[PDB]
């Protein structure tokens, strides 16, 4: 219903962002919220007929706008570290039920020096599990990435699968004693033994990493951690 | 705010989940709204009502006669219903929404034939890690986090092979340590 | 003359109460300038076009489940809810009237600053009622939650005549009688 | 018409292009309970009994009036820019109590059948304007969708002061002076 762009965002202190939102077709009211673990769901502003109708308590650097087709944009200037949040958009016909969009996950950092793409590896099933349960569990490991702006998916023979898949809901920190700690994510794909034991079947674990754009300055020796896809694959074996 | 909910709640998969909400100071011109938010997503509207009973394709809402409390009925709790459920109030006058603590609903499947075992998966040609798999244990088994700095243990994960109607729990452990063993890598 | 152009829009959410809380009716009115072109009547349950200017509005509002349900529920969330606050405030407001007779040949009985609107005024000349030469203004609304009414009596005063003005009001247990005697 | 013991206008909403200007107020049996200052975002009740026990969020008025602004632009186009018709207002001046020379009183200037709801109401002590002691009500609704407005003037009745109520409206050719 409600769409928001972009999905993920990385910025530094002092910069500005513009978040877009498309309401449900026919809806005239667009509300903007900020969601944080500490402060919860905080209201920014609500727009109707290209005009701000309701206002929250955020400073003047938080501004919004609505266009003729009811699409809305939101701007945050001179960003601060405390502005890292999920910025949600909620559409309503005019005053009734509000339907939220996916949101834009914004992270504000002091520098981009700690951004890393993930390393992805696939671990083939255990021969002991196959002979004991007649099933085969493949494990995918995405390690050493920052921030936690990733989307993992499994692909079997060119088609994305969801059945028999379990991805960890929250990644773990590799060095929890640090605030700039990288993350690790695990996912499991369990199929039947006969399906895995067929060399004609192809298994791919794909991780979509959202990193720096082409406009971000980069001076470190390593490759620029731009938005990329990292994957690992495995054929079945008899 | 005006609503109070239990911070956490458990429910068995396939059974009905009755989520309570208290709001004694609610007004006669205030609707009861229910939202839920799956991790890494935005809030999802469920149902709303003014007085007594309302139903839709997703749930049922039962507000008491005195309107001081309400219950969200999830007819057949599924694994997808694991989320945080927010019970709020609203005038439907075009004003902001206010969320409270919410109820963190955990839908736990029943493993009919538990066969707990620990396996070691084949090492990748890349990566120096040795991954371990604790699988096929009941939904009451605790999976503690890693006590060692070089060992990493994930949380309990439930996969559903829907074609065979088979569900199983799993946890993963790995490390690059020299003599890391999958025997008692969990605990 | 040289008056600027003006376009006026009005919306009125009106509630009609009868028999306390037994009979309640909601009529919302959408008015362009001074022309009501669309309305919602709770006795009907849907929006209706009043002039050829509001078929598009009524069709759209009836096709949107959220608008029709919100408007249907406003009979309870607006009319019935706010009426319970009228029972505790407005419907209990009692302001007793002040009765004064002033000569003007005409004799004016002024009944000023009373609430509610129910008022009863009668003229008497030596305890006999006068009706033939009595003029009363309509109920005068002062605009500050008080009312006023002026009742005039054409008189040919003799000696010993006692003109009296009898006033009854819901805030009074007994009628107020004010006398007047010629000099 | 509709027969009822009590009629309440829980939502007298007004918005016009001259200004542009709006007004939100609630009425009960023809009297104004409150109005919302759309510039100050503040509910102003009209009786002390209302300010003690009653509550109304001014944000509701700002939300509704913003809809009327959107609705006005839509009906202007639909009516091929049909403008409002200026009506002739009726003015009446009287006192709140019988005027006794020496006892403070209050003059009431009733301007009825106002449309469009744009009017200037001012007092004149002799032939000069008055500033102190002047107050007025909001535009009060009528069943024919016109308005009436009441202005008050506190004064000390004297034998040399002859007051006037000057009313300016587009439906009139000259400012109407009603004498008392």
């Amino acid at each position: 219903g409600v769409t928001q762009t972009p999905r993920y965002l990385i910025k530094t202190r002092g910069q500005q962002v513009t978040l877009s939102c498309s309401p449900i077709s026919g809806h005239r009211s667009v509300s903007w919220y900020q969601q944080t673990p500490g402060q919860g769901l905080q209201f920014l502003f609500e727009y109707f007929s290209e005009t701000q109708r309701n206002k929250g308590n955020f400073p003047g650097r938080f501004s919004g706008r609505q266009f003729s087709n009811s699409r809305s944009e939101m701007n945050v200037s001179t960003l601060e570290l405390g502005d890292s949040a999920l910025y949600l958009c909620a559409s309503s016909l005019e005053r009734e039920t509000q339907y939220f969009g996916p949101g834009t996950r914004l992270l504000v950092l002091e520098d981009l020096k700690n951004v890393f793409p993930p390393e992805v590896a696939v671990f083939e099933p255990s021969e002991a599990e196959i002979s004991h349960t007649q099933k085969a569990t493949l494990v995918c490991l995405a390690t050493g990435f920052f921030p936690d702006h990733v989307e993992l998916s499994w692909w079997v023979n060119g088609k994305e699968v969801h059945s028999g898949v379990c991805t960890d809901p929250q990644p773990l920190k590799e060095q929890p004693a640090l605030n700039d700690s990288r993350y690790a994510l695990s996912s499991r794909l369990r199929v039947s033994a006969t399906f895995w034991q067929n060399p004609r079947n192809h298994f791919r674990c794909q991780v979509q990493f959202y990193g720096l754009s082409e406009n971000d300055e980069w001076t470190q020796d390593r490759a620029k951690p731009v938005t990329q896809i990292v994957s690992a694959e495995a054929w079945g074996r008899a | 705010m005006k609503t109070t909910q239990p911070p956490s709640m458990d429910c068995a998969e396939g059974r009905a989940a009755n989520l309570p909400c208290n709001h004694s100071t609610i007004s006669g011109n205030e609707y009861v709204y229910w939202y839920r938010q799956i991790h890494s997503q935005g809030p999802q509207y469920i149902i709303h009502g003014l007085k007594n009973n309302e139903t839709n394709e997703m749930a049922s809402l039962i507000i008491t006669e005195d309107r001081k409390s309400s219950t969200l009925i999830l007819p057949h709790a599924t694994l997808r219903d694991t989320a945080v459920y927010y019970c709020i109030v609203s005038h439907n006058a075009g004003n902001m929404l206010t969320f409270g603590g919410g109820t963190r609903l955990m839908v736990k499947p029943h493993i009919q034939n538990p066969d707990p075992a620990v396996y070691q998966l084949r090492d990748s040609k890349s990566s120096d890690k040795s991954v371990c798999l604790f699988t096929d244990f009941d939904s009451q088994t605790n999976v503690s986090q890693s006590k060692d700095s070089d060992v990493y243990i994930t949380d309990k994960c439930v996969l559903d092979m829907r074609s065979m109607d088979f569900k199983s729990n799993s946890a993963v452990a790995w490390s690059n340590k020299s003599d890391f063993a999958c025997a008692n890598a969990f605990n | 003359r040289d008056s600027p152009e003006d376009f006026v829009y009005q919306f009125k959410g009106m509630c009609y109460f009868t028999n306390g809380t037994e009979r309640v009716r909601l009529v919302t009115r959408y008015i362009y300038n001074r022309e009501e072109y669309a309305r919602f009547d709770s006795d009907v349950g849907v929006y209706r076009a009043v002039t050829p200017l509001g078929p598009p509005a009524a069709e759209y509002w009836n096709s949107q489940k959220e608008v029709l349900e919100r408007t249907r529920a406003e009979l309870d969330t607006v009319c019935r809810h706010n009426y319970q606050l009228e029972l505790r405030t407005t419907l209990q407001r009692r302001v007793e009237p002040t009765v004064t007779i002033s000569p003007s040949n005409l004799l004016v009985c002024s009944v000023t600053d009373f609430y509610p609107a129910q008022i009863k005024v009668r003229w008497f000349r030596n305890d006999q009622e006068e009706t033939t030469g009595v003029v009363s203004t309509p109920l005068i609304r002062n605009g500050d939650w008080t009312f006023q009414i002026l009742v005039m009596l054409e008189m040919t005063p003799q000696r010993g005549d006692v003109y009296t003005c009898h006033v009854e009001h819901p805030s009074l247990q007994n009628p107020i009688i004010v006398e007047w005697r010629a000099q | 018409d509709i027969v009822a013991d009590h009629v309440a206008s829980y939502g007298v909403n007004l918005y016009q292009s001259y200004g542009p200007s709006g007004q939100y107020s609630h009425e009960f049996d023809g009297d104004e309970e409150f109005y919302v200052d759309l510039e100050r975002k503040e509910t102003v009740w009209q009786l002390p009994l209302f300010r003690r026990f009653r509550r109304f969020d001014p944000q509701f008025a700002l939300t509704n009036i913003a809809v009327l602004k959107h609705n006005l632009n839509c009906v202007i186009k639909r009516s091929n820019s049909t403008a409002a018709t200026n009506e002739v207002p009726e003015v009446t001046v009287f006192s709140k109590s019988p005027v006794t020379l020496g006892q403070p009183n209050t003059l009431i200037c009733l301007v009825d059948n106002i449309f469009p709801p744009v009017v200037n109401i001012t007092w004149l002590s002799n032939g000069h304007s008055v500033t102190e002691g002047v107050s007025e009500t909001s535009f009060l609704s009528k069943s024919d969708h016109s308005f009436f407005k009441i202005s008050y003037l506190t004064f000390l009745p004297s034998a040399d002061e002859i007051y006037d109520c000057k009313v300016e409206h587009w439906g009139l050719d000259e400012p109407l002076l009603k004498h008392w």
Partner: peptide, 15 residues
């Protein structure tokens, strides 16, 4: 103690 509401004005058809 509790806020009372007015009638909600429904929006016109224009975008």
């Amino acid at each position: 103690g509790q806020v009372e509401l007015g009638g909600g004005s429904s929006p016109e058809t224009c975008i």
